[PDB]
A paper describes a structure:
Adenomatous polyposis coli ([name]) is an important human tumor suppressor protein which plays critical roles in diverse cellular processes such as Wnt/β-catenin signaling, cell adhesion, cell migration, mitosis and chromosomal instability, and so on. The N-terminal armadillo repeat ([name]) domain of [name] is the most conserved region among its vertebrate and invertebrate homologs, and mediates its association with a variety of binding partners including [name] membrane recruitment 1 ([name], also named as [name] for ‘Wilms tumor gene on the X chromosome’), Asef, Sam68, and IQGAP1. By recruiting [name] to the plasma membrane, [name] regulates the [name]-dependent maintenance of intercellular junctions. In addition, together with [name] and Axin, [name] promotes ubiquitination and degradation of β-catenin, thus negatively regulates the Wnt signal transduction pathway.
Intriguingly, ITC experiments demonstrated that peptides of [name]-A1 (residues 325–335) and -A2 (residues 496–508) sequences exhibited approximately equal binding affinities for [name]–[name] as full [name]-A1 (residues 280–368) and -A2 (residues 380–531), respectively. Therefore, [name] residues 325–335 and 496–508 are regarded to represent the core A1 and A2 fragments for [name] binding, respectively, although other conserved [name] residues nearby such as residues 315–324 may also contribute to the interaction with [name]. To further understand the molecular basis of how [name] recognizes [name], we determined the crystal structures of the [name]–[name]/[name]-A1, [name]–[name]/[name]-A2, and [name]–[name]/[name]-A4 complexes to 1.90 Å, 2.00 Å, and 1.70 Å resolutions, respectively. Despite possessing apparently different sequences, [name]-A1, -A2, and -A4 adopt remarkably similar conformations when bound to [name]–[name], both in anti-parallel manners with respect to the armadillo repeats of [name]. At all three interfaces between [name]–[name] and [name]-A1/A2/A4, four highly conserved asparagine residues, N507/N550/N594/N641 from the H3 helices of armadillo repeats 2/3/4/5 of [name]–[name] function as rivets fastening [name]-A1/A2/A4 onto its surface groove. In addition, two basic residues, [name]-K516 and -R549, straddle the middle portion of [name]-A1/A2/A4 peptides on both sides. They form salt bridges with a conserved acidic residue A1-D330/A2-D503/A4-E370 and make hydrogen bonds with the main chain carbonyl groups of A1-C328/A1-G329/A2-S501/A2-G502/A4-G368. Moreover, two tryptophan residues, [name]-W593 and -W553, provide more binding affinity by hydrogen bonding with A1-T326/A2-S499 and making van der Waals interactions with A1-G327/A1-G329/A2-Y500/A2-G502/A4-G367/A4-G369, respectively. Furthermore, substitution of the crucial hydrophobic residue [name]-F510 by a lysine reduced the complex formation between [name]–[name] and [name]-A1.
Author numbering:
A (entry chain B): 325 to 334
B (entry chain A): 403 to 738
Write the structure that this text describes.
Amino acid sequence: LTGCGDIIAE
Amino acid sequence: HHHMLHLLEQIRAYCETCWEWQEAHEPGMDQDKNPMPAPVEHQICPAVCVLMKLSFDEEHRHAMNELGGLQAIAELLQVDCEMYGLTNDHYSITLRRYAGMALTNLTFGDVANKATLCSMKGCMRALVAQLKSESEDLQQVIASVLRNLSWRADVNSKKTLREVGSVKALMECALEVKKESTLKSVLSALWNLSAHCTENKADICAVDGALAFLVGTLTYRSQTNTLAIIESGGGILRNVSSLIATNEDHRQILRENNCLQTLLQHLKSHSLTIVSNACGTLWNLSARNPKDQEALWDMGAVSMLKNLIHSKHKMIAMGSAAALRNLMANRPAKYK
């Protein structure tokens, strides 16, 4: 399976 | 960190005033006519604005965490959402946006904070409810929080995210979003959530129109020429493809949306992410279906997959080879 990790706001 | 401490105390004081009002003004029960606290009366938006701005710096996040900043900000978001519901009031919308942005920053790479936030069941329900806000800017922010919480979710967090109905809410959100920026954040959140378990995969597939929509994302041409929508839409499709594979109705939706043809184009993309997603999707779709196997053969899939089996990338090498062997086990008569 795939995913895209975390993100910072904005 | 006296200034930060002061802002957090301001927020906590406001929450207490709200909780006290809530307690004295229960639904259907005897109440006086004293009005609900309004966040504007307590300069809440500027307080959350400063905290949000500080949260971009890891040293400030360290300080914020020592002071329990995540819990205070989450409590504030939850109480405003409970008190005022899906308001279009500008002040309330911006304060929710700022709170959500801070929560996104505080959960970035932070195992402990993700777990704490998921443990706040009332706040999780409030987050999910915000996906129906008429503000797409707020939707974007909320989807980023859920995206973070869905990444490397522990057992409790996975359960919580599912129990608050985040999967159906985000997929339903996606069908309606008009801004690309909002769509990007929502699909990214779904991408992470779709990996958790079969039930999340089923919930995505069960939303009327969702599969046709996701196939649509595979050829979406960005207003900013980026590939983010194709990557995330294709990522969701890859993750749910194991369930699609065993459902003839769902395979038919993919067929009428020219999905296999599109996936074969993706095999020749220059984007590692896109190729990796397409290999995983075809791995699943190439299994146990003579119709789609023959279609793949006729479209030249075998040649394309043979060009990928020697990839240095594990997912591409694994997926291309698995799809290839599925096809080689089921050669149509004319290819004997």
